[PDB]
């Protein structure tokens, strides 16, 4: 396994915003409770899952556990930076797999709910 993505970085500037707080309290914590969230709550463990090709294909891994820790630590400058981590997570799943696969159906469902909730953010 590669090291998981950083959740803190002392030479990157931090910021808290109403939108970033909404992404943690409302968006992330609601997606977390969805029945399809469990593949996406932690970095992919390629050793445990026997996916030795996973990190041969995926060069920018992302997961909701990493995102959650970045929000809690105020790692992000703005909401868009965080939204991009969500998009990387969903697109990784479509890249590493095939249309119709069970994991893809799960990601497809979560992406729809994710888009519903970021449709309107706080001001
Ligand atoms: C929630 C805490 N633990 C302990 C049970 C759950 C383990 O998380 C897991 C378990 C199984 C998982 C994954 C994540 C996430 C996957 C995945 C993918 C592809 C194939 C695959 O399997 C063929 C697969 O399998 C994929 O693209 N992702 C993102």
mmCIF file of C-alpha atoms and ligand atoms in Angstrom, residues 38-42 44 49 51 54 93 96-97 103, ligand 1:
data_model
loop_
_atom_site.group_PDB
_atom_site.id
_atom_site.type_symbol
_atom_site.label_atom_id
_atom_site.label_comp_id
_atom_site.label_asym_id
_atom_site.label_seq_id
_atom_site.Cartn_x
_atom_site.Cartn_y
_atom_site.Cartn_z
ATOM 1 C CA UNK A 38 -18.980 1.806 3.241
ATOM 2 C CA UNK A 39 -16.609 1.160 0.279
ATOM 3 C CA UNK A 40 -15.691 4.866 0.409
ATOM 4 C CA UNK A 41 -15.103 5.538 4.116
ATOM 5 C CA UNK A 42 -11.351 4.742 4.138
ATOM 6 C CA UNK A 44 -8.543 1.391 -0.402
ATOM 7 C CA UNK A 49 -8.757 -6.628 -0.552
ATOM 8 C CA UNK A 51 -6.346 -5.528 -5.403
ATOM 9 C CA UNK A 54 -5.465 -0.786 -7.605
ATOM 10 C CA UNK A 93 -14.159 4.368 -8.928
ATOM 11 C CA UNK A 96 -10.743 1.396 -11.752
ATOM 12 C CA UNK A 97 -13.933 -0.498 -12.605
ATOM 13 C CA UNK A 103 -19.141 -0.823 -6.730
HETATM 14 C C1 LIG B 1 -15.780 0.024 5.856
HETATM 15 C C2 LIG B 1 -14.520 -0.589 6.484
HETATM 16 N N1 LIG B 1 -14.033 -1.770 5.769
HETATM 17 C C3 LIG B 1 -14.080 -2.968 6.618
HETATM 18 C C4 LIG B 1 -15.073 -4.026 6.124
HETATM 19 C C5 LIG B 1 -14.711 -1.973 4.502
HETATM 20 C C6 LIG B 1 -13.677 -2.303 3.437
HETATM 21 O O1 LIG B 1 -13.808 -1.336 2.445
HETATM 22 C C7 LIG B 1 -13.725 -1.856 1.162
HETATM 23 C C8 LIG B 1 -14.061 -3.184 0.938
HETATM 24 C C9 LIG B 1 -14.233 -3.622 -0.355
HETATM 25 C C10 LIG B 1 -14.057 -2.757 -1.422
HETATM 26 C C11 LIG B 1 -13.685 -1.435 -1.207
HETATM 27 C C12 LIG B 1 -13.596 -0.978 0.101
HETATM 28 C C13 LIG B 1 -13.750 -0.260 -2.185
HETATM 29 C C14 LIG B 1 -13.591 -0.361 -3.492
HETATM 30 C C15 LIG B 1 -13.589 -1.587 -4.252
HETATM 31 C C16 LIG B 1 -13.383 -1.114 -5.567
HETATM 32 C C17 LIG B 1 -13.318 -2.005 -6.579
HETATM 33 C C18 LIG B 1 -13.462 -3.374 -6.292
HETATM 34 C C19 LIG B 1 -13.665 -3.830 -4.938
HETATM 35 O O2 LIG B 1 -13.814 -5.183 -4.625
HETATM 36 C C20 LIG B 1 -13.772 -6.047 -5.734
HETATM 37 C C21 LIG B 1 -13.743 -2.899 -3.875
HETATM 38 O O3 LIG B 1 -13.947 -3.455 -2.620
HETATM 39 C C22 LIG B 1 -13.293 0.271 -5.533
HETATM 40 O O4 LIG B 1 -13.125 0.986 -6.465
HETATM 41 N N2 LIG B 1 -13.419 0.600 -4.331
HETATM 42 C C23 LIG B 1 -13.370 2.000 -3.901
#
